[PDB]
C-alpha cells in the first residue's frame, strides 16, 4: 500500500527537467514552423477544400 | 375620408401583423433542427394556411372594402373566394388536428409514439389540405354555390362587383365542414384533456400533501370560439333568414374570423423552445 506509493514517488524523483523557457521556445518554434500546413489556422481556398 | 383612411390603416396593420408572425413561425421551424417535431409539422401547416390567408385574401378584401368595387376580373373574384374558403377551412381543421394530436399524446401515452410518425403526420396534413381544397375550389370553380335569385345573378354577371351570394345548401355544408365538426371534435378533446389534467392534479395532491389547465384551455378554446362562432352563426342565418342579417355585419364577422389567423401563432407558439428560436432569429 504505502510502500508502493513511496517507491513510485522515489522513482518519479530522479527525472531530468529542462527549463520552462526552453520548452516554451520549442513549442513556439514548432507552432511557427508547422503553421503553413494548417487548413484550420489559415482559411483553405474553396477549390482546395475537399468538403466545400 | 377620415373614416376610410382609418379602416385602411387598421387593415394594413392587421395584414402586416399576420404576415410577420406567420413568416416568423415558419422561419423558426425550418431554421432549427430542434424545432422540427411531429406536432410542429401541424404547427407549420397552420402557419402556412394563415400566411396564405394574410397574403391573398386580407389585402384584396381590404381593397374591396375601401374602394367599394372589384377592379380585377370576375375569374379573379372566384379565385379569391376559393382561396379564402380554402384558407379558413385548412386553418380550422389544422387546429382540430392539433387538438386531436394532443388528445392522443395525453390519453394514450404508451401508444402515442407509434400512433403518430413523420410519414403519418405528412399523410394527415396532406389529407386535411386535400379535403379543404376540394370543399373550397370544387363547388366554387364549378359554380355549384351560385344562388338563383336575381340579386345574385346580376352581381355574378356584372364585372365590377365581387360579392358573396350562396345557396341554402352549400352555405350549410361549408359552414359545417369548416367549423362545426372541428368545433365538436375540439370540445370533446379538450374536455377529455381537462378531465385527465384534473385527475393528475388530484393524484398529485393525494400524494405529496405538503388552475393552470383551466387558463390554457380557456385561451385555446375561447379565442377560437369568440373569433369564428359568430361568423358561422350568421353564415347559417343568412340562408335560413335573409332579411335579418346585414351585409356589413357579415363582413365584420368574417374579418374577425380573419384576425383569428393572426391571433393563432401567439397562442400556439408560447413554448420556451419557440421563444429561444424567436430570440435567435431576431
Amino acid at each position: 500500500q504505502a510502500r508502493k506509493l513511496v517507491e513510485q514517488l522515489k522513482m518519479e524523483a530522479n527525472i531530468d527537467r529542462i527549463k520552462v523557457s526552453k520548452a516554451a521556445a520549442d513549442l513556439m518554434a514548432y507552432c511557427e514552423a508547422h503553421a503553413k500546413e494548417d487548413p484550420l489556422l489559415t482559411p483553405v481556398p474553396a477549390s482546395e477544400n475537399p468538403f466545400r | 375620408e377620415v373614416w376610410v383612411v382609418g379602416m385602411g390603416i387598421v387593415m394594413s396593420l392587421i395584414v402586416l401583423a399576420i404576415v410577420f408572425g406567420n413568416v416568423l413561425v415558419i422561419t423558426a421551424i425550418a431554421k432549427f433542427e430542434r424545432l422540427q417535431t411531429v406536432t410542429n409539422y401541424f404547427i407549420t401547416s397552420l402557419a402556412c394556411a394563415d400566411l396564405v390567408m394574410g397574403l391573398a385574401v386580407v389585402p384584396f378584401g381590404a381593397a374591396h372594402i375601401l374602394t367599394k368595387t372589384w377592379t380585377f376580373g370576375n375569374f379573379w373574384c372566384e379565385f379569391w373566394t376559393s382561396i379564402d374558403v380554402l384558407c379558413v377551412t385548412a386553418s380550422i381543421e389544422t387546429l382540430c388536428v392539433i387538438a386531436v394530436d394532443r388528445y392522443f399524446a395525453i390519453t394514450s401515452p404508451f401508444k402515442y409514439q407509434s400512433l403518430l410518425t413523420k410519414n403519418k403526420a405528412r399523410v394527415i396534413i396532406l389529407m386535411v389540405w386535400i379535403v379543404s381544397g376540394l370543399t373550397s375550389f370544387l363547388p366554387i370553380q364549378m359554380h355549384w354555390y351560385r344562388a338563383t335569385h336575381q340579386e345574385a345573378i346580376n352581381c355574378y354577371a356584372e364585372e365590377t362587383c365581387c360579392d358573396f351570394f350562396t345557396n341554402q345548401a352549400y352555405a350549410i355544408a361549408s359552414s359545417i365542414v369548416s367549423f362545426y365538426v372541428p368545433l365538436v371534435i375540439m370540445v370533446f378533446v379538450y374536455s377529455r384533456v381537462f378531465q385527465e389534467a384534473k385527475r393528475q392534479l388530484q393524484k398529485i395532491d393525494k400524494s405529496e400533501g405538503r388552475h393552470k389547465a383551466l387558463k390554457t384551455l380557456g385561451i385555446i378554446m375561447g379565442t377560437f370560439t369568440l373569433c369564428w362562432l359568430p361568423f358561422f352563426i350568421v353564415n347559417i342565418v343568412h340562408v335560413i333568414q335573409d332579411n335579418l342579417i346585414r351585409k356589413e355585419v357579415y363582413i365584420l364577422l368574417n374579418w374577425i374570423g380573419y384576425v383569428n389567423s393572426g391571433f393563432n401563432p401567439l397562442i400556439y407558439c408560447r413554448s420556451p423552445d419557440f421563444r429561444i428560436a424567436f430570440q435567435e432569429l431576431l
Binding site: A2, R3, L5, V6, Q8, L9, K10, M11, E12, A13, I15, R17, I18, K19, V20, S21, K22, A23, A24, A25, D26, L27, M28, Y30, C31, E32, H34, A35, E37, D38, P39, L40, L41, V44, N49, P50, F51, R52 | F32, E33, R34
Partner: protein, 331 residues
C-alpha cells in the same frame, strides 16, 4: 510513518518543479501576433443516430469516421460524401467509446458493459471480445492492428493482444476511474486522465507511470497530446483547460474564461498545434489559441451537449458529435 516519507518526496517534487520554472508561456508568447478571429461553419451535418452520441474517431485518412450511441448501432460514415458505409449493431446497449484502427481493417467499441468488443470491418462481426476489466471502459485506442489500450472504470488501464485476447500488461496507480486516454505519434508513450485530479504519463513497454500531473481541481474528462508529443492538454469539470509539458513536468497554462462555468467534455489540437479545440457542457465548442490562451472562435451549432471532438490527421476538418444525435463537420 510512510506517510511522512511520501509527503517529503511530494514536497521535494513540488520544490523541484517550482525551481525549474523560469517564466510562463505568456511571457514569451505575448510578443508574437495573435491568431485572430477564426470562423467555422458546418460543412457537413451527418444524420442517422437514434440516441445521443459520446465518441468518434477519425480514420487514418480524413475520409472515414466512426460514431456510436446508446441506440446500439456503431455507424461508420463517409465524411466527404455523407454516406453510411457500414452500420454495426452492438450487443451492449450502452457504449461509451470508439476506436478506428490505423490500417482501417478493425473498429473497436467499449461500453458500460466491461467488455472491449473489436469488430472486423473487412471480412461486420465481433472478431474478439476482450474481458477482464472491473469497470466500464471509458476510452479505447489502437497502437496497431494487434494491440489496443483501454481505460476502464476500475483504476487499472490495460494493454491487450487481440489475437491472444489477454492483457499483456496492466497500468496501476490511479485513485479514481480513468475517463480519457491519448496515444503519442510514436506508440511508445500514452497518458490517462482519471477522476482524481492527477493525470499520469505511461510507458507502454515498461508499464510504469513516469510522471504525474495534478494541476486540476476536479475530474479530468478529456486529454490529448500536442502534435509534437512533448505536451498534452486536459479538460475537466472545472471550466479550466490546462496544457502540460512532459519535459518541464509541470503545468504551462490554463485556458478559462470568467463567463463559462461548464465543464469540458472533449479536447483536441489542430495539426500545427496552434489551436486547441475544447467541447463544453454549454452546448457549444470554443477554439482557444494554445500559445496566446485567448479564445479565437466559437462553435454554437449543436443543440445538445457535445461529447466528442476530433481533428483529421490531414487537418482538414473538425467533427463534433453532441447529445442531439447530430454529428457536424466543421472546417
Amino acid at each position: 510513518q510512510l506517510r511522512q516519507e511520501a509527503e517529503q518526496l511530494k514536497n521535494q517534487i513540488r520544490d523541484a518543479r517550482k525551481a525549474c520554472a523560469d517564466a510562463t508561456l505568456s511571457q514569451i508568447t505575448n510578443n508574437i501576433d495573435p491568431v485572430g478571429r477564426i470562423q467555422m461553419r458546418t460543412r457537413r451535418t451527418l444524420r442517422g443516430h437514434l440516441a445521443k452520441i459520446y465518441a468518434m474517431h477519425w480514420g487514418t485518412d480524413s475520409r472515414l469516421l466512426v460514431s456510436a450511441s446508446q441506440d446500439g448501432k456503431l455507424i461508420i460514415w463517409d465524411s466527404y460524401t455523407t454516406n453510411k458505409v457500414h452500420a454495426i449493431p452492438l450487443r451492449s446497449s450502452w457504449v461509451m467509446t470508439c476506436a478506428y484502427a490505423p490500417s482501417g481493417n478493425y473498429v473497436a467499441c467499449g461500453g458500460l458493459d466491461n467488455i472491449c468488443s473489436i469488430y472486423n470491418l473487412k471480412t461486420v462481426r465481433v472478431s474478439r471480445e476482450l474481458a477482464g476489466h472491473t469497470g466500464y471502459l471509458s476510452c479505447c485506442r489502437f497502437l496497431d492492428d494487434n494491440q489496443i489500450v483501454t481505460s476502464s472504470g476500475d483504476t487499472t488501464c490495460a494493454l491487450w493482444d487481440i489475437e491472444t485476447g489477454q492483457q499483456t500488461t496492466t497500468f496501476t496507480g490511479h485513485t479514481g476511474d480513468v475517463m480519457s486516454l491519448s496515444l503519442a505519434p510514436d506508440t511508445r508513450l500514452f497518458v490517462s486522465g482519471a477522476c482524481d485530479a492527477s493525470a499520469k504519463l505511461w510507458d507502454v513497454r515498461e508499464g510504469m507511470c513516469r510522471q504525474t500531473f495534478t494541476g486540476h481541481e476536479s475530474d479530468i474528462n478529456a486529454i490529448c497530446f500536442f502534435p509534437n508529443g512533448n505536451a498534452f492538454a486536459t479538460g475537466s469539470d472545472d471550466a479550466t483547460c490546462r496544457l502540460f509539458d512532459l519535459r518541464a513536468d509541470q503545468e504551462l497554462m490554463t485556458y478559462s474564461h470568467d463567463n463559462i462555468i461548464c465543464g469540458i467534455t472533449s479536447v483536441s489540437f489542430s495539426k500545427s498545434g496552434r489551436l486547441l479545440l475544447a467541447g463544453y457542457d454549454d452546448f457549444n465548442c470554443n477554439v482557444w489559441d494554445a500559445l496566446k490562451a485567448d479564445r479565437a472562435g466559437v462553435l454554437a451549432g449543436h443543440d445538445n451537449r457535445v461529447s466528442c471532438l476530433g481533428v483529421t490527421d490531414d487537418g482538414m476538418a473538425v467533427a463534433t458529435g453532441s447529445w442531439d444525435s447530430f454529428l457536424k463537420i466543421w472546417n
